[PDB]
């Protein structure tokens, strides 16, 4: 039945766009002697080259790149004038070698100039025909693009005559206009695939066709000149016979001497400056926030190159977060705005957003966080109960309200969201793990403002690394980004903040994450262990870190120090000798020096090392698991990871 409803128009328009993108961007991978090549599948039918058979890619492998061009053989040997015979006076000693060596050097250059002659022939006679196919292939892509616009235009013009609300027609016109931008972008991907595909074919015909001919022609031109040097040295009389064999062996050209070819050194020739500008000015980011505290100055701005506009209320302070400076919305009714035309999504666009978050609300109350909705159309993130909620609403009233449960107060989280329209898939990550995997097949059109707003209600918050992409992301990218950002020189707390000297803490073991260490007296000595399963009500001990260099604040990897316990009397950790248990002493002189460090894949955990032996828990002993200097292999490796506060 004919299209008569905006909902049916949206479904028709989406199918045309997805089918067009699959057709135009099709490729296949071929392993060649020459490297790895991406073959454009539709090249055969576009211009009728090797189009006489079932498959284009199969024919390409059998015949090779040469089969594409029309004039196959065009090479011509130039005129060579190697008079290699040295031109005899004096020279009575073996110091003749000085004269002969300079002749040896020149013959190498003459071999090179011939090599450049063949490259120029390849450029002028063999590359020219490849560049012609590139231009024709581009003309073909644009021609097909021009036809799809007409089909879409005709359908919309017909629909304008039907009985649909003036306002709904306005939105359909806006959605169609933004789709034309997406078709242009997808066509630009295909053009890039064509370029590299034929550039590698052109470079390769040199390796397999022109280069072997250059070998054969120069092979004879050596037999003609090396013999001419042998004849000369017999004529020379002053030097002894025994030296004649030596110098002949020392001035003889093998095939190696004239062999010049680098697959990389030719690619540098093919690349112009215009290609450098294009790669230096293209990115997937619509927004890349750059924050920089300065003396009586804040700098907050977008360095993504699309020049998003930023507006923020004064009193927005900068503070160190995870790996640089974070916005601190300390006081209520504070806001930040980002303005860009790309933020109006529509029907076909795909995008991603990611940022770090830390919430000091510690209250169970709903609150707005980040929003791009206008008249209940668009998306947003906000707090509910303990966790977060992500919402996305359609012009027709289709919704997705997804609940994320992990979030609690005073911790650092990494949130990453992706929207994919070719696959109709939604992905959400928290830190390292994939939380949600949904189909948004029913969502259709989303059209909203050009402004994204970041706000507070009463909760103070830190935000860091806010960024927006114009494409979807995969699981592998998320994991790499997460760990790479945390791979800096600082040790962290259990909550993700930097450790500090001269600050109180509680000590936990990774194997038992909810029991804290407490002091135990067995003999006159004092030890540490985790609390048993019944006396968990007991209060844990309190610890501090100390460095000899006072005025040092934050702990970094490979720093040395001591460990102190608060109480009526100062205590310090020391290793017993009778057993390797850790015991407390009341003298700072006998306190052991310990090294602090962590693991790349356990960012918020810590380790203590003494003379390259880690400190770990022990196997059960009556009611106690002691803290010891371990050397056994019968204790799990996990037992030597600790956490503070």
């Amino acid at each position: 039945s004919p299209i008569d409803t905006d909902k049916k128009y949206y479904l028709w328009l989406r199918e045309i766009f997805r089918n067009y993108s699959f057709d135009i961007t099709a490729t296949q991978e071929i392993n060649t002697d020459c490297g790895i090549n991406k073959v454009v599948t539709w090249f055969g039918k576009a211009l009728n080259i090797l189009n006489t058979s079932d498959s284009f890619v199969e024919e390409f492998q059998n015949l090779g790149p040469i089969s594409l061009i029309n004039k196959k053989e065009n090479l011509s040997m130039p005129i060579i004038e190697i008079y290699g015979i040295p031109n005899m006076l004096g020279l009575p000693l073996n110091d003749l070698n000085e004269k002969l060596f300079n002749i040896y050097l020149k013959n190498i250059l003459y071999f090179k100039k011939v090599y450049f002659n063949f490259l120029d022939q390849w450029w002028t006679e063999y590359y020219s025909q490849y560049f012609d196919l590139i231009c024709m292939a581009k003309q073909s892509i644009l021609a097909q693009e021009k036809l799809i616009k007409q089909i879409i235009q005709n359908k919309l013009q017909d629909l304008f005559k039907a009985d649909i609300s003036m306002d709904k027609l306005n939105l359909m016109n806006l959605a169609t206009e933004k789709t034309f931008i997406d078709l242009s972008n997808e066509s630009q991907i295909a053009i890039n695939n064509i370029n590299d595909f034929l550039n590698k074919s052109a470079i390769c015909v040199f390796d397999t066709n022109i280069y072997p001919k250059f070998i054969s022609f120069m092979e004879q031109c050596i037999n003609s000149v090396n013999s001419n040097v042998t004849a000369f040295i017999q004529k020379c009389t002053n030097i002894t016979e025994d030296e004649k064999l030596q110098l002949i062996k020392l001035n003889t050209f093998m095939n190696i001497d004239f062999e010049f070819f680098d697959i990389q050194s030719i690619k540098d020739l093919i690349t112009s400056e215009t290609d450098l500008i294009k790669e230096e000015k293209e990115s997937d980011y619509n927004l890349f926030l750059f924050t920089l505290q300065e003396d009586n100055n804040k700098v907050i701005e977008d360095i993504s190159g699309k020049n998003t506009l930023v507006k923020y209320s004064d009193s927005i302070s900068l503070v160190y977060g995870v790996n640089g400076d974070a916005l601190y919305l300390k006081e209520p009714d504070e806001s930040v705005s980002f303005s860009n035309k790309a933020f109006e999504n529509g029907l076909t666009n795909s995008f991603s957003i990611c940022f770090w978050l830390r919430n000091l609300g510690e209250d169970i109350i709903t609150s707005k966080l980040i929003e791009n909705k206008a008249d209940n159309c668009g998306w947003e993130i906000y707090f509910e109960n303990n966790g977060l909620v992500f919402s996305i609403v359609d012009c027709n009233g289709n919704e997705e309200n997804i609940y994320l449960s992990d979030v609690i107060s005073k911790n650092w989280y990494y949130i990453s969201i992706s929207i994919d329209r070719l696959r109709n898939q939604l992905l959400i990550f928290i830190n390292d793990k994939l939380i949600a995997n949904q189909s948004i097949e029913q969502i259709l059109n989303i059209y909203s403002s050009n402004t994204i707003s970041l706000v507070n209600e009463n909760n103070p918050i830190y935000i860091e690394g806010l960024s927006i992409l114009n494409r979807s992301i995969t699981s592998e990218e998320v994991v790499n980004n997460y760990f790479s950002y945390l791979n800096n020189s600082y040790i962290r707390d259990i909550s993700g903040e930097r450790l500090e000297y001269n600050k109180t803490y509680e000590l936990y073991n990774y194997v038992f994450p909810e029991n804290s260490l407490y002091e135990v007296t067995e003999n006159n000595n004092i030890y540490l262990s985790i609390k048993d399963t019944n006396n968990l009500n007991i209060q844990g001990a309190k610890f501090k870190l100390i460095n000899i260099d006072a005025n040092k604040q934050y702990v970094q990897k490979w720093d040395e120090g001591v460990v102190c316990l608060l109480g009526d009397e100062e205590k310090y950790v020391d290793i017993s000798s009778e057993n390797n248990r850790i015991q407390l002493v009341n003298s700072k002189d006998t306190a052991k020096r310990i090294i602090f460090n962590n693991d790349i894949f356990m960012p918020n955990c810590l380790t203590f090392a003494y003379n390259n032996k880690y400190l770990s828990l022990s196997l059960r002993d009556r009611n106690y698991n002691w803290m010891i200097c371990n050397n056994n292999d019968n204790i799990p490796k996990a037992a030597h990871l600790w956490a503070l506060k």
């Binding site: 160190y320 400076d325 509910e384 997804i402 038992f512 460095n547 040092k552 720093d559 059960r620 204790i635």
Partner: protein, 1264 residues
């Protein structure tokens, strides 16, 4: 604490450790057996387990006992004292291996302490009793020539020999009056039938490890893990948690279904992995509740036990404490025992999800089956376990000394071929399905599909709830961390038990099972040509030598000498061809490469969310599903999805979630609020209960069908390879002896080349099928469930809002708040996460030598094939993995490769890789540099092999075949650049050879290529030599690092990735690539101004930029620019709290030498411009400048450049600027600018920025 005793079968009876026993199923009729006490409360009886078996059942017949195993019969096993003594010695060895690790000691410790409760369900609650067949066993005291005298003892475990089948083991419980004390919380004596000689064989078809010769060839089980697996069943029986509930029942309504007995939830819990995910959360809560009730029963008795009747010697107070510890009860001051849920929860999860075959195997480093439903192969015999050369206590078969530990080579059938013996097909019995058309073929019942019935899943979701002010959301997680279990064991505390001696048994009431055989053949009629028929067509009788490939399914199925093939017509046409002696050696290489290319064909997927690639010939090979053999397989897949592959679409069970009933409190405002909160939390529980119900159905009905398809394909591919070799071997024997002597082909090389290709094909098929399976769950099962959950949400919303209104008066000032909360709460969905149910979370693949790993001032091979390395006193080594070779005679290394594995001679699949540092040419010695060539590495025997040589300025790789033909490929670096990227600097090399081309990569980029199609055969082997060999100066040397050899061709992506991993380091590097150091003089070099350097002004405290000098009196062939010029800098520690290596993000001083003093680089605290010159002045401290720097590395790709950042203070977030070079135009200045701070954050990092620096120390490899 656990002690193992020692015995010999011929030792006299002592009535303390060797006795005469009357086992439970003897019913007190006599026939005593001789027993040995392996350990406290554990006994061994070396005899055949004959109870309930007919005497004639010990001989093989037409019958069978089990329908899912190959059964081996041997009526002479254990029939003489010599054999009977061999049984005890092996048993003692296996127990010693179990207690060699803490996890094994805990399992034995729990079994000893887990005494059965001295009671039974028929006993009054106020007493103990011991005249029960499940508690006591009789022993004989009287001498053989005396009237009988008996005595009783306590025991926990009794171990027998195998019954009629030797490769099947069991644990049996004792049942009285059809009731089992082991399923009612009490516990009882357990029995086990065991045989440690014949073991099971499995395979790892689902494990991906790339192109490997020995991957997926069959493994045999470690008998120690078999015993442990059976000991977990004992642990359940002793603690009385062996409950029965809803089992898994197979579907048997179609000819292609697998037939089996019901499976109990305990068996799946015991196995571990993702198998407990097949039990729905509804049944998890059901089992948890029955166990809790039974423990509540036991506590009632401990509070009421006062007297003992059977034995007056029993001390009640002693026993009460044992049971209190066994069940982890809690005691109060008054003397009352109770249960605390926290304690009970930890106990329950330890026994059920803690001790599992998957956890035990991981800890001991043994290989086992992937899943309970995985396929099995015929058993084997282990020749001798008592031989320490084969089986050791510390590491079993995987002995590291023999190079059998890597990848579990110890249990690999193809490798460790001396530890086992194949069984004679005569004695094996199997259950077979014989399917005749209207021809007839036989298929083992293990080869069909397994599909669970609709009756195996519970529907407790559809029952009503009652919500009250104190309702909790119970939820059982199927997990318990293993490390918490290990740390809980005590290896020093003593073990103490009551006396075992007691009164004799008098009541012999007990139930003895009975067994019977069943017919082992079943006949059916069917006319469908399914997977079973399409595999039988790819076989030929061993009696026929002449065969030919065909694409006609019917033609192959009709003629005895014709074989079906699903490859291309091209491949089939070539294979049937006949050629002459002049072309046999070329035809063989051509076809075998075609087979490897025919398999390993794949296509990418773009428009489907979950799948990534497709294999197009699966339909032709098997014809499984809706006649996938017809038309184009790929086209049909796109329009229909994964449904086309399933042989049977199952009906999905989805209950309607029951209604909530909310209580009515009169005036408690707080209680009304709590009931609303409890209902909202309880709703999130129903979401996870529904998701669990779907995943269980997917694992046992859809995922099993896909597994059978993976096995079919692996079987189908091997059939093709067998046929190809038989065709080759026939054409070889036809040639006359005279003519045959001129054909040199190695059949061993042919066989391994094919196996390597098959492994690559199976990897692609795994990825494809795994995507298809998951894709089905997300798109055709989960959405049908979310729909009925959303219906439940709507119904609940009406119920809650109506509940608020009826209590509106009591909620003064709160009704409006609750109504908002309910509306907001029930609008969201709880998203589905698969990672909860599955255990789901490459560099090292195909490595045969990993030579350069420094250890204790020596090199060693970490490969795990045990190559021998000899380093002579002339070689220099350091802990940075950097050895140096020299012109001295003793500067040499020798590596002797193991004979077992070497690269194929006929096809040449292998690669080499390393780092290298070649010094600079001498200025005067130019002529010698350009002409002389020397070798550095050599592997050649009889002048046939490979080598690596350095001609002047050129690095080469040559290859010589048996007939003396030579090839070569090389890389050449410019020697005219002002600043070279290679001349004395570390760089990465990688060489690669296949049957067609040789390639060389430098830092991950292809550099050269050469054609080697002509090369006949390379026969190098045995030895590798590192040594400078040739006309060289006395002052020649080379550095090397990270040398390795791969037995497979490497891809461009792998080489590029390997470049980054080996380039990574937490410290900074200097100009040459060596680590940067404190207190060492350096020269500065700016990346953006490579031709300029720094100097101190003659009258001002500002550095001036000059121009780098260039080579003078130039020889026309050489050109470069100086490096040892300008100011010498030095990096100093700022703190000294903490080795001299500089690490990223360090705070430093940047000093330099002026005449005979040390100066420092300062900056003005305040300037009114983006750029300003730096201040140079002697050492001092003041409030006018900043003298703190932090050394940074902004780039993420490998590099030798670093950036220098000024800061106000260590704890401050303020930044001043980055050091660099700026032009104030046309002068250049040593400046600090704020401008760079924005640039360094732009992606991609710009290498040409003016803020990138390198440090150049003096080196012996570079001269003026």
């Amino acid at each position: 604490p656990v002690t193992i005793n020692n015995f010999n079968y011929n030792d006299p009876i002592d009535n303390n450790n060797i006795i005469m026993m009357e086992p439970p199923f003897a019913r007190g009729t006599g026939r005593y057996y001789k027993a040995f006490k392996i350990t406290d409360r554990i006994w061994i009886i070396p005899e055949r387990y004959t109870f309930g078996y007919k005497p004639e059942d010990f001989n093989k017949s037409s019958g069978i006992f089990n329908r899912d195993v190959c059964e081996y019969y041997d009526p002479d096993y254990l029939n003489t004292n010599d054999k009977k003594n061999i049984f005890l010695q092996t048993m003692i060895k296996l127990f010693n291996r179990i207690k060699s690790k803490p996890l094994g000691e805990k399992l034995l410790e729990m079994i000893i302490n887990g005494i059965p409760y001295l009671g039974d369900r028929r006993v009054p609650l106020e007493e103990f009793n011991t005249n029960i067949a499940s508690v006591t066993v009789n022993k004989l005291i009287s001498n053989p020539g005396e009237v009988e005298r008996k005595k009783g003892i306590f025991a926990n475990l009794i171990i027998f020999g195998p019954g009629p089948v030797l490769n099947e083991n069991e644990t049996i419980d004792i049942g009285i009056q059809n009731h089992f004390a082991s399923r009612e919380g009490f516990g009882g004596i357990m029995q086990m039938k065991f045989c440690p000689e014949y073991v099971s064989v499995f395979n790892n078809v689902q494990e991906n490890k790339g192109a490997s010769i020995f991957n997926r060839r069959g493994y045999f089980s470690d008998p120690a893990l078999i015993l442990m697996h059976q000991l977990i069943y004992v642990l359940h029986g002793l603690y009385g948690i062996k409950v029965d509930d809803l089992p898994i029942v197979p579907n048997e309504k179609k000819f292609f279904m697998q037939s089996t007995d019901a499976i109990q939830a305990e068996e799946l819990y015991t196995f571990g992995g993702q198998d407990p995910s097949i039990i729905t959360p509804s049944t998890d809560k059901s089992i948890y509740d029955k166990v809790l009730q039974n423990f509540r029963g036991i506590v009632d008795r401990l509070n009421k036990v006062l007297v003992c009747i059977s034995d007056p010697n029993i001390n009640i107070n002693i026993y009460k404490n044992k049971f209190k510890d066994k069940y982890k009860f809690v005691e109060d001051s008054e003397g009352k025992y109770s249960i605390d849920v926290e304690s009970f929860d930890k106990l329950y999860k330890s026994l059920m999800f803690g001790f599992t075959e998957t956890n035990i195997a991981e800890n001991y480093k043994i290989k086992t089956r992937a899943s309970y439903f995985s396929d099995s192969l015929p058993p084997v015999k282990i020749k001798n376990l008592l031989d320490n050369e084969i089986y050791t206590i510390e590491e079993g078969f995987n002995i590291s000394d023999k190079d059998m530990e890597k990848e579990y080579r110890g249990q690999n059938k193809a490798i460790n071929k001396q530890a086992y013996e194949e069984i004679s097909k005569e004695h094996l019995a199997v259950y077979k399905i014989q399917m005749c058309k209207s021809i007839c073929i036989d298929v083992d019942n293990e080869d069909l599909f397994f599909i669970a019935d609709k009756n195996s899943f519970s529907d407790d979701l559809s029952k009503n709830e009652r919500i009250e002010y104190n309702t909790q959301s119970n939820y059982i997680e199927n997990d318990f961390p293993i490390n918490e279990l290990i740390l809980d064991t005590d290896l020093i505390s003593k073990i103490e038990l009551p006396s075992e001696n007691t009164e004799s048994l008098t009541d012999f009431n007990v139930d003895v099972p009975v067994y019977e055989k069943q017919p082992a053949i079943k006949k059916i009629f069917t006319d469908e040509n399914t997977i079973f028929q399409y595999l039988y067509s790819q076989t030929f009788p061993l009696d026929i030598r002449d065969i030919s490939l065909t694409s006609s399914f019917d033609d192959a199925l009709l003629f005895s000498n014709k074989v079906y093939s699903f490859f291309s017509m091209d491949y089939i046409k070539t294979a049937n061809k006949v050629v002459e002696a002049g072309l046999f050696a070329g035809w063989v290489k051509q076809i075998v490469n075609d087979f490897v290319i025919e398999a390993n064909k794949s296509n990418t997927m773009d428009k489907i969310a979950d799948i990534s690639l497709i294999v197009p010939y699966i339909g032709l090979a098997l014809n499984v599903g809706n006649e996938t053999a017809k038309g184009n397989f790929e086209n049909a897949f796109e329009i229909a999805g994964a449904s086309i592959l399933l042989e049977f679409i199952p009906e999905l069970l989805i209950p309607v979630v029951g209604a909530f009933l909310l209580e009515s409190y009169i005036d408690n405002k707080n209680k009304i609020i709590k009931t609303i909160d409890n209902a909202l939390t309880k709703r999130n529980e129903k979401w996870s209960d529904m998701y669990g119900l779907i995943v269980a159905q997917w694992l046992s009905t859809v995922n099993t069908q896909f597994y059978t398809i993976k096995e079919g394909m692996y079987k189908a591919l091997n059939y093709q390879a067998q046929a190809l070799e038989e065709i080759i071997k026939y054409r070889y024997n036809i040639y006359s002896e005279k003519e045959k002597s001129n054909i040199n082909i190695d059949f061993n090389d042919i066989n391994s080349k094919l196996n390597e290709g098959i492994n690559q094909a199976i990897d692609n098929i795994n990825n494809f099928i795994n995507g298809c399976s998951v894709s089905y769950l997300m798109k055709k099962m989960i959405p049908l469930a979310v729909e009925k959950l959303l219906d439940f949400d709507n119904t609940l919303k009406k119920n809650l809002l109506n509940y608020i209104d009826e209590n509106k008066l009591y909620l003064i000032g709160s009704a409006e708040y609750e109504k908002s909360k309910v509306n907001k709460y029930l609008k969201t969905i709880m998203p589905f996460d698969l990672s909860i149910y599955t255990n789901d979370t490459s560099e090292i693949l195909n490595n045969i030598i990993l030579n350069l790993r420094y250890k204790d001032n020596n090199l060693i091979d970490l490969s795990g094939y045990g190559a021998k390395v000899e380093v002579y006193d002339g070689v220099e080594l350091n802990d940075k993995n950097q050895f140096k070779l020299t012109s001295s005679a003793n500067s040499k290394i020798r590596v002797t490769q193991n004979q077992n594995i070497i690269f194929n001679s006929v096809f040449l699949d292998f690669s080499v890789s390393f780092w290298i540092r070649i010094p600079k040419y001498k200025n005067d010695g130019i002529q010698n540099y350009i002409h002389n060539e020397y070798t550095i590495i050599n592997c050649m025997k009889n002048n046939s092999g490979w080598k690596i040589s350095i001609r002047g300025n050129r690095i080469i790789w040559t290859l010589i075949d048996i007939n003396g033909k030579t090839k070569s490929v090389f890389f050449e670096y410019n020697i005219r650049e002002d600043i070279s990227e290679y001349i004395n600097r570390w760089f990465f090399v990688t060489i690669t050879n296949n049957l067609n081309n040789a390639k060389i990569y430098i830092n991950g980029k292809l550099e050269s290529n050469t054609d080697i199609k002509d090369i006949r055969e390379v026969i190098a082997n045995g030895e590798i030599i590192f040594k400078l060999d040739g006309d060289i100066d006395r002052t020649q040397f080379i550095w090397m690092k990270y040398f390795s050899i791969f037995n497979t061709e490497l891809s461009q992506s792998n080489i590029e990735e390997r470049y980054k991993i080996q380039s990574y380091s937490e410290y900074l590097k200097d100009f040459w690539g060596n680590p940067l150091m404190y207190n060492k003089e350096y020269y500065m070099f700016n990346a953006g101004n490579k031709n300029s350097y720094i100097k101190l002004k003659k009258d001002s405290p500002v550095g001036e930029i000059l121009t780098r000098s260039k080579y003078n009196q130039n020889s026309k062939y050489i050109n470069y620019r100086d490096l040892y010029i300008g100011e010498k800098f030095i990096i100093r520690r700022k703190s000294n709290s903490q080795d001299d290596i500089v690490r990223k993000e360090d705070y430093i001083y940047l000093d330099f030498f002026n005449l005979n003093q040390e100066w420092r680089v300062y900056t003005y605290k305040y300037f009114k411009k983006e750029e300003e010159k730096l201040f140079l002045a002697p050492i001092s401290d003041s409030d006018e400048f900043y003298n703190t720097i932090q050394i940074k590395e902004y780039d993420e790709q490998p590099t030798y450049s670093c950036q220098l950042l000024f800061k106000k203070d260590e704890e401050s977030t303020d930044e001043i600027g980055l050091i660099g070079i700026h032009r104030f135009y046309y002068k250049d200045y040593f400046c600090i600018s704020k401008w760079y701070l924005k640039e360094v954050k732009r992606k991609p990092y710009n290498l040409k920025l003016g803020c990138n620096w390198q440090f150049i120390p003096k080196d012996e490899g570079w001269t003026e």
